[PDB]
């Protein structure tokens, strides 16, 4: 049974998935790799179904990949997204902070501002920015959600617990953890800024371009530099908050079909990659943005043999992620 069951987070992803399934079935030979679609309400449900052996694969932001290795799930990153170009594969991205032109604040002064995050635990939208302000938060810095809550004057942090920390969903009631929530994810976080619901969107250098196709309309937005200055949105190389490692497909440590997933995905990038088949597209969709994989991807690279989650993220990010709950100041 050479069939990879991919975990679709919710109605939109599911539809991309069912047509991912369908087009692969027709272009790929009878005995090649198959794909099946399992729908779940959230990545976190996808982590658990995979460990429970009801699915095989799901693409996660790096921040989440760490959550996924943590017991009792024990998932490994297995195939990485890459950006830039096929000719020049980029296995990382810039985390930035996007803002409107002429509007006061800088990095060192984000108290009482309204904020749009991609999601709780995700790299650019959460782990990086929150980690930068960890110690300036008001004590007690535990639990984190509470402390980020009081620190802004309203937020959207997808996947957070709306009933426990109600101010982290003030900008997106329910803190929906799927594209259903329009303020969820990178393009979701950015839409949240555009509509003036929030003062800053913590996203990735590609987001603004993925979401606004006019250099005219973009001159209206700026980035927050670390040295408490602002810069035009195409100058991210010089005004980013941190570099983080690319989203990876994660899979079971034991019996995980890691080899089968690579054969699926690497055949997928052949037929339905960037400007390949008019028909189906792996890194875009009519149904939405960043479904099953980031639109900003160009392809996949195999994660080097037996590199577990800790090894993938880097030593000082893993230390960062942890001390983003515990280490004093
Ligand atoms: Fe990310």
Domains and CATH numbers, the chain: 1-82+248-329 (3.40.190.10), 83-247 (3.40.190.10)
Neighbours of 109 (CB within 10 A): 11
Q: By what technique were these coordinates determined?
A: X-ray
Strand, coil or helix: 99? strand
Q: Identify the DSSP state of 179.
A: T
Residue 78's φ and ψ, nearest 5 degrees, are -125, -40
CA distance 160 to 133: 19
List Cα–Cα distances, 121 to 67, 94, 144, in angstroms: 8, 16, 11
CA distance 260 to 161: 35
Q: How far is the CA of 123 from the centre of ligand 1 (A)?
A: 5
Q: How far is the CA of 8 from the centre of ligand 1 (A)?
A: 17
Which ranges in the chain belong to alpha helices (H)?
10-27, 43-51, 62-69, 128-133, 144-151, 185-194, 207-211, 215-218, 258-271, 309-313, 315-322
Which has the closest alpha carbon to 228: 312, 75, 109, 70? 109
Q: What sign does the dihedral 282-48-158-225 (CA atoms) show?
A: negative
Residue 118 is assigned to a ligand binding site: yes
Residue 281's φ and ψ, nearest 5 degrees, are -130, 130
Q: How far is the CA of 24 from the centre of ligand 1 (A)?
A: 27
Strand, coil or helix: 73? coil
Strand, coil or helix: 191? helix
Q: How far is the CA of 35 from the centre of ligand 1 (A)?
A: 24
How many CA atoms are closer than 13 Å to the CA of 107, on its beta-carbon side?
22
Residue 186 is assigned to a ligand binding site: yes
List Cα–Cα distances, 47 to 13, 26, 58, 159, in angstroms: 16, 29, 8, 14
Residue 124 is assigned to a ligand binding site: yes
CA distance 180 to 291: 12
For 162, the token pair is: 């709306």
Strand, coil or helix: 298? coil
For 92, the token pair is: 């990382």
Residue 125 is assigned to a ligand binding site: yes
Q: How far is the CA of 19 from the centre of ligand 1 (A)?
A: 25
Q: How far is the CA of 208 from the centre of ligand 1 (A)?
A: 14
Q: How far is the CA of 236 from the centre of ligand 1 (A)?
A: 16
Which has the closest alpha carbon to 106: 291, 231, 194, 252? 231
Q: How far is the CA of 81 from the centre of ligand 1 (A)?
A: 11
Which has the closest alpha carbon to 116: 245, 202, 226? 202
Residue 236 is assigned to a ligand binding site: no
Cβ-based neighbours of 100, under 8 Å, separated by 6 or more: 193, 196, 220, 221, 222
Q: Identify the DSSP state of 166.
A: G
CA distance 52 to 281: 30
315 CB-contact burial (10 Å; exposed 0-12 / middle 13-18 / buried 19+): exposed
Resolution in A: 2.8
How many separate helices (H) and strands (E) can be counted in the chain? 11, 14
306: left (phi over 0), alpha (psi -120 to 50) or beta: left
Q: How far is the CA of 294 from the centre of ligand 1 (A)?
A: 9
**Helix, strand, coil share (%) of the chain residues, nearest 5:** 35, 20, 45
Q: How far is the CA of 41 from the centre of ligand 1 (A)?
A: 19
């Amino acid at each position: 049974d050479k069939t990879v069951r991919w975990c679709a987070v919710s109605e939109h992803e599911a539809t991309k998935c069912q047509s991912f399934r369908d087009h692969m079935k027709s272009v790929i030979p009878s005995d090649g790799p198959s794909v099946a679609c399992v729908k779940k309400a959230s990545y976190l449900d996808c982590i658990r179904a995979i460990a429970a052996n009801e699915a095989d694969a799901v693409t996660l932001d790096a921040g989440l990949v760490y959550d996924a290795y943590l017991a009792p799930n024990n998932l490994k990153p297995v195939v990485a997204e890459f950006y830039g170009s096929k000719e020049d594969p980029q296995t990382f991205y810039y985390a930035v902070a996007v803002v409107k032109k002429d509007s006061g604040f800088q990095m060192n002064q984000l108290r009482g501002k309204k904020s749009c995050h991609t999601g709780l635990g995700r790299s650019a939208g959460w782990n990086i920015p929150i980690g930068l302000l960890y110690c300036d938060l008001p004590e007690p810095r535990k639990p984190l959600e509470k402390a980020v809550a009081n620190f802004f004057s309203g937020s959207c942090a997808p996947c957070a617990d709306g009933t426990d920390f109600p101010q982290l969903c003030q900008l997106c009631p329910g803190c929906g953890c799927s594209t259903l929530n329009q303020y969820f994810g990178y393009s979701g976080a950015f839409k949240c800024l555009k509509d003036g619901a929030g003062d800053v969107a913590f996203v990735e250098h590609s987001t603004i371009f993925e979401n606004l196709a006019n250099k005219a309309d973009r001159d209206q937005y700026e980035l927050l530099c670390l040295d408490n200055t602002r810069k035009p949105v195409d100058e991210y190389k010089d005004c980013h908050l941190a570099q983080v490692p690319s989203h990876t497909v994660v899979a079971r440590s034991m019996g995980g079909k890691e080899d089968l997933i690579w054969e699926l995905l690497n055949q997928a990038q052949e037929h339905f990659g960037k400007d390949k088949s008019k028909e189906f597209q792996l890194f875009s969709s009519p149904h939405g943005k960043d479904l099953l994989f980031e639109d900003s991807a160009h392809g996949f690279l195999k994660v080097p043999p037996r590199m577990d989650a800790k090894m993938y993220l880097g030593y000082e990010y893993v230390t960062a992620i942890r001390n983003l709950r515990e280490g004093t100041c």
